Design a protein around this motif. Structure first.
Motif, PDB file in Angstrom:
ATOM      1  N   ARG A  87     -31.290  11.114 -12.190  1.00 25.55           N
ATOM      2  CA  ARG A  87     -32.536  11.404 -12.827  1.00 25.55           C
ATOM      3  C   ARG A  87     -32.917  10.359 -13.848  1.00 25.55           C
ATOM      4  O   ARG A  87     -34.126  10.156 -14.064  1.00 25.55           O
ATOM      5  N   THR A  91     -36.913   9.349 -13.187  1.00 30.57           N
ATOM      6  CA  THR A  91     -38.031   9.535 -14.121  1.00 30.57           C
ATOM      7  C   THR A  91     -38.827   8.229 -14.300  1.00 30.57           C
ATOM      8  O   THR A  91     -40.029   8.256 -14.517  1.00 30.57           O
ATOM      9  N   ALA A  95     -40.721   9.894  -9.926  1.00 29.55           N
ATOM     10  CA  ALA A  95     -40.344  10.702  -8.811  1.00 29.55           C
ATOM     11  C   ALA A  95     -40.417  12.164  -9.162  1.00 29.55           C
ATOM     12  O   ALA A  95     -40.005  12.574 -10.227  1.00 29.55           O
ATOM     13  N   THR A  96     -40.935  12.933  -8.227  1.00 30.90           N
ATOM     14  CA  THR A  96     -41.021  14.388  -8.358  1.00 30.90           C
ATOM     15  C   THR A  96     -40.559  15.064  -7.079  1.00 30.90           C
ATOM     16  O   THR A  96     -40.566  14.472  -5.980  1.00 30.90           O
ATOM     17  N   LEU A  97     -40.174  16.328  -7.238  1.00 25.54           N
ATOM     18  CA  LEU A  97     -39.906  17.220  -6.153  1.00 25.54           C
ATOM     19  C   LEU A  97     -41.155  18.056  -5.956  1.00 25.54           C
ATOM     20  O   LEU A  97     -41.707  18.550  -6.948  1.00 25.54           O
ATOM     21  N   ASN A  98     -41.586  18.235  -4.717  1.00 25.74           N
ATOM     22  CA  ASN A  98     -42.806  19.004  -4.457  1.00 25.74           C
ATOM     23  C   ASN A  98     -42.596  19.962  -3.340  1.00 25.74           C
ATOM     24  O   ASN A  98     -42.073  19.555  -2.310  1.00 25.74           O
TER      25      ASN A  98
ATOM     26  N   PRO B   1     -45.243  23.922  -6.246  1.00 21.05           N
ATOM     27  CA  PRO B   1     -45.004  23.304  -7.543  1.00 21.05           C
ATOM     28  C   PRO B   1     -44.528  21.861  -7.440  1.00 21.05           C
ATOM     29  O   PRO B   1     -44.078  21.399  -6.362  1.00 21.05           O
ATOM     30  N   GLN B   2     -44.744  21.177  -8.541  1.00 22.56           N
ATOM     31  CA  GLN B   2     -44.314  19.812  -8.743  1.00 22.56           C
ATOM     32  C   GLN B   2     -43.304  19.832  -9.898  1.00 22.56           C
ATOM     33  O   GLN B   2     -43.585  20.272 -11.010  1.00 22.56           O
ATOM     34  N   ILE B   3     -42.083  19.402  -9.589  1.00 26.04           N
ATOM     35  CA  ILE B   3     -40.996  19.391 -10.541  1.00 26.04           C
ATOM     36  C   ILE B   3     -40.709  17.945 -10.911  1.00 26.04           C
ATOM     37  O   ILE B   3     -40.326  17.132 -10.043  1.00 26.04           O
ATOM     38  N   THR B   4     -40.898  17.618 -12.183  1.00 24.34           N
ATOM     39  CA  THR B   4     -40.494  16.342 -12.757  1.00 24.34           C
ATOM     40  C   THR B   4     -38.986  16.383 -13.082  1.00 24.34           C
ATOM     41  O   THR B   4     -38.362  17.452 -13.014  1.00 24.34           O
ATOM     42  N   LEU B   5     -38.394  15.259 -13.416  1.00 23.20           N
ATOM     43  CA  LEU B   5     -36.944  15.139 -13.458  1.00 23.20           C
ATOM     44  C   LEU B   5     -36.392  14.749 -14.808  1.00 23.20           C
ATOM     45  O   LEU B   5     -35.307  14.319 -14.973  1.00 23.20           O
ATOM     46  N   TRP B   6     -37.221  14.957 -15.840  1.00 21.62           N
ATOM     47  CA  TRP B   6     -36.772  14.749 -17.199  1.00 21.62           C
ATOM     48  C   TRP B   6     -35.637  15.685 -17.669  1.00 21.62           C
ATOM     49  O   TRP B   6     -34.833  15.344 -18.549  1.00 21.62           O
TER      50      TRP B   6
END
Lengths: 99, 99
Positions: A87, A91, A95-98, B1-6
């Motif tokens: 991660r 970041t 990059a994101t998970l969707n 949803p959109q998940i960021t990785l912070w």
């Protein structure tokens, strides 16, 4: 890119003046490669813990390119079954998970 | 949803009448929980780790809800430091990595 997850998300990385393949790992906090030569100062880092600890070299502020996208961050160097993009680097490329 | 990785991508799961939290892990082939009971048949499965193999229970075709989205897929039950949603289940919810 949009990457589906039917196969392991393995991509080409430019790092340390070399090309390497690595796994995109949203479950990993950090980024690790097996043995690459990197510039600058390093310090030892203990990682893992479950079963024991592994010692690695921590390099800060290393530039890489993840499938073409530039990112700067900490890179750990030590044995690893597969090189991993974690991660800390994901970041940087947005990059994101969707779903 | 959109998940960021912070932060670690931990989400709410419904599985066999229970609520749990799990880490979305693109670096994991499989999905594993610990402290859950599931109905139906299972078979043992070996998974490699530091020091050799661990034996877990493999339950196929288990319905789960991951952050609101229905899936059916294999769930392993055994010790794990954190519950994990792996690629087997992420494909079913249509999750993708995007940058």
């Amino acid at each position: 890119p949009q990457i589906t997850l039917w196969k392991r998300p393995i991509v080409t990385i430019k790092v340390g003046g070399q090309l390497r393949e690595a796994l995109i790992n949203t479950g990993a906090d950090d980024t690790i490669f097996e043995e690459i030569s990197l510039p600058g100062r390093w310090k030892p880092k203990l990682i893992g813990g479950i079963g024991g600890f592994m010692k690695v070299r921590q390099y800060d502020q290393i530039p890489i390119e993840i499938a073409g996208h530039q990112a700067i961050g900490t890179v750990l160097v030590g044995p690893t079954p597969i090189n991993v993009i974690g991660r800390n680097m994901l970041t940087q490329i947005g990059a994101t998970l969707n779903f």
